[PDB]
Design a protein around this ligand. Structure first.
Ligand SMILES: COCCNC(=O)COc1ccc(F)cc1
Lengths: 300, 237
């Protein structure tokens, strides 16, 4: 179990760690988060009490280094940093633990939610969307735009998701215009799963990463990305049985975890109704459909 | 975006554009089978592609053989329309390719956008006008060539005959849509109006009779009357 210590908490902030969150008051004696499960990526995220504008955060994997949080009063945010000095860092953590100034990552032992939301999420892969290679961790916020959004302005701060566009020459083989547009199997399988993604694990990874950025940061381009990726699979007549089955699981836990109150903005009515009721795979997402119908029958 | 009464004059500027109507592409007669069920028999159709400035009509004849062995024909028709329009653009010299294509039914936007991905500089647009191009099969010479076709075939017409020698494309288009609106609302009366006077003929290379300017006004008036009329008979006003 690993630890992200905080130098201090100078400004009142709501701190999130994966799907958990807690309030820290201005200059409360708070020195970070302990017992973080190894083996998963994690995201620590922030919403300032004074400006709920800009939720922001850091994707990290504790196996990839010792990371700490330190408020920067010039840039005005909690910054993730890497401590290269291993003994400096163990020593810092042990003192804070002894003085019990750290909250415990509060995982119930029955609980596979985080695993189920991040099964295909890998930091090394994540670092090729959020390009900032001098850091082992990755910063995202609510306002970062995607590579495709900038096509339709600063490329350094972009989310380089895979660009999916259903009315593109990439998506549409000359002479199969109608076939490929009504049945996206060639785009999903040959171009996407096979030429860029290579396997379904990688495709599922970005789909998962898009959702989480949508939910935690309300990053609108991630929501479009998450949605695009679902629609391409729902609109393909030929999808490996194991992908459909895995997709149903993935979406199920995503729908389960979404805040009830944020559903109106984070869920695209057209995409879901099409995926669950009109698409080729209208019959293949039994778990996802049951939870969608029982928790958000309004959207449908 | 879309095309309506506000930007109506854009049709007659010098940016090449084409209207595409797909309403006569897939045409069927519906009949009873010996077992008392219902079946459709397809008949030949046409794509109505019209340059509203010049009057050039690219009448692509859709032979019933294109449907043989196909399912979901009403949906295929939109994609076959789109394919034939994109083939037409591609056959045209660059300086003749349209800058816009305006589809008269919104269901054509996606089929055509997809078939025209190779032409990203050609804007595909809908319209909110209720244009009467479906009545193009009430023009005898157009109907005749479509029904006689034995194979796919493109036939070029000028739907304005020689009108542009005497009037403007705005005026020519308004006459055409009034003629077609009339034919759509009451074909028999509309046609009675057009031919009542045997002395006015249709030149072999024209679609419509050779009316003087003065005769056109009488004709245009009579067609307005018919349209208002049928509107009464229809609503009892
Ligand atoms: C090079 O093309 C784009 C790379 N494709 C991928 O599938 C990598 O996506 C990710 C992204 C984030 C993850 F948490 C897992 C996987």
């Amino acid at each position: 179990m690993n630890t992200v210590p905080f130098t201090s908490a100078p400004i009142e902030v709501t701190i999130g760690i994966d799907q958990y969150s807690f309030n820290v008051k201005e200059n409360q004696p708070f020195h970070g988060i302990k017992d973080i499960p190894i083996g998963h990526v994690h995201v620590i995220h922030f919403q300032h009490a004074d400006n709920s504008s800009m939720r922001y955060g850091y994707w990290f994997d504790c196996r990839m280094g010792n990371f700490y949080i330190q408020y920067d009063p010039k840039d005005g945010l909690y910054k993730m940093m890497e401590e290269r000095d291993g003994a400096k860092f163990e020593n810092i953590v042990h003192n804070f633990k002894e003085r019990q100034m750290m909250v415990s990552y509060p995982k119930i032992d029955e609980d596979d939610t985080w695993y189920n939301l991040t099964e295909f999420v890998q930091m090394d892969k994540i670092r090729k969307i959020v390009r900032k290679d001098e850091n082992q961790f990755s910063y995202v916020d609510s306002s970062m735009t995607t590579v495709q959004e900038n096509e339709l302005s600063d490329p350094a701060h972009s989310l380089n998701y895979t660009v999916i566009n259903f009315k593109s020459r990439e998506a549409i083989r000359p002479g199969h215009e109608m076939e490929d547009f009504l049945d996206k199997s060639y785009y999903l399988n040959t171009v996407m799963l096979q030429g860029i993604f290579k396997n379904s694990s990688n495709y599922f990874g970005e789909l998962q990463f898009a959702f989480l950025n949508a939910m935690f940061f309300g990053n609108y381009g991630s929501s479009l990305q998450w949605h695009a990726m679902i629609e391409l699979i729902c609109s393909s007549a030929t999808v490996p049985k194991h992908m459909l089955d895995k997709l149903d699981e993935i979406l199920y836990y995503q729908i389960k975890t979404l805040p009830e109150q944020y559903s109106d903005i984070l869920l695209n009515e057209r995409v879901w109704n099409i995926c669950l009721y009109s698409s080729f795979q209208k019959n293949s997402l039994h778990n996802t459909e049951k939870i969608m119908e029982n928790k958000y029958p309004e959207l449908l | 975006g879309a095309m309506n009464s506000s930007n109506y004059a854009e049709l007659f500027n010098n940016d090449i554009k084409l209207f595409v109507d797909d309403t006569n592409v897939y045409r069927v007669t519906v009949h009873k089978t010996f077992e008392g069920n219902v079946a459709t028999k397809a008949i030949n159709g046409c794509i109505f592609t019209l340059n509203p400035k010049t009057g050039h009509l690219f009448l692509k004849i859709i032979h019933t053989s294109v449907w043989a062995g196909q399912k979901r024909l009403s949906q295929l028709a939109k994609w076959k329309t789109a394919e034939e329009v994109s083939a037409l653009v591609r056959s045209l010299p660059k300086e003749e390719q349209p800058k816009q294509i305006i589809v008269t039914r919104k269901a054509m936007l996606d089929p055509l956008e997809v078939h025209m991905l190779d032409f990203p500089n050609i804007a595909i647009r809908p319209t909110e006008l209720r244009l009467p191009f479906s009545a193009a099969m009430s023009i005898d010479k157009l109907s005749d060539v479509v029904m006689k076709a034995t194979e796919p075939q493109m036939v070029l017409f000028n739907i304005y005959d020689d009108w542009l020698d005497r009037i403007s494309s705005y005026t020519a288009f308004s006459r055409l849509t009034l003629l077609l609106r009339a034919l759509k609302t009451n074909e028999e009366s509309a046609k009675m109006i057009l031919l009542s006077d045997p002395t006015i003929t249709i030149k072999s290379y024209h679609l419509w009779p050779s009316f003087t300017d003065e005769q056109w006004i009488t004709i245009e008036s009579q067609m307005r009357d018919l349209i208002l009329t049928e509107y009464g008979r229809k609503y009892n006003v």
